Structure 1
């Protein structure tokens, strides 16, 4: 039954490798999203501070 055990472990290892590589791909994607959102929040801050400037003026 060892040859079957081998086949089962290889399938489990295949899935594990896929799951981890997928997590790394996700990490890269989330990082890009993080930058895009950060920039949008920065613009929101810019808008608000510009409004504060106008009020002060």
Structure 2
């Protein structure tokens, strides 16, 4: 029947979307260590300015 064919195609697209979402979000989780550096350098700069003010 065309109904089950069309339903299975939507169900296949749904399974693909969540499987691709898992891969995207797993790759995004690996970026956390690279994105962390933007805050780390600001904490260095904050302590450096405070240190100069103490000198």
Fold match, TM over 0.5? yes
Aligned position for 1:24: 22
1:9 aligns with 2:15: no
Q: How many residues align?
A: 55
- What's the secondary structure of 2:7's corresponding residue? helix
1:22 CA drift (Å): 1.4
TM-score (norm 2): 0.76
Structure 1, unaligned stretches of length 5 or more? none
Would you identify which runs of 4 or more consecutive aligned residues in structure 1 move more than 6 Å?
A: none
TM-score (norm 1): 0.74
1:34 CA drift (Å): 2.6
Structure 2, unaligned stretches of length 5 or more? none
One of 38, 45, 48 as aligned partner of 2:36: 38
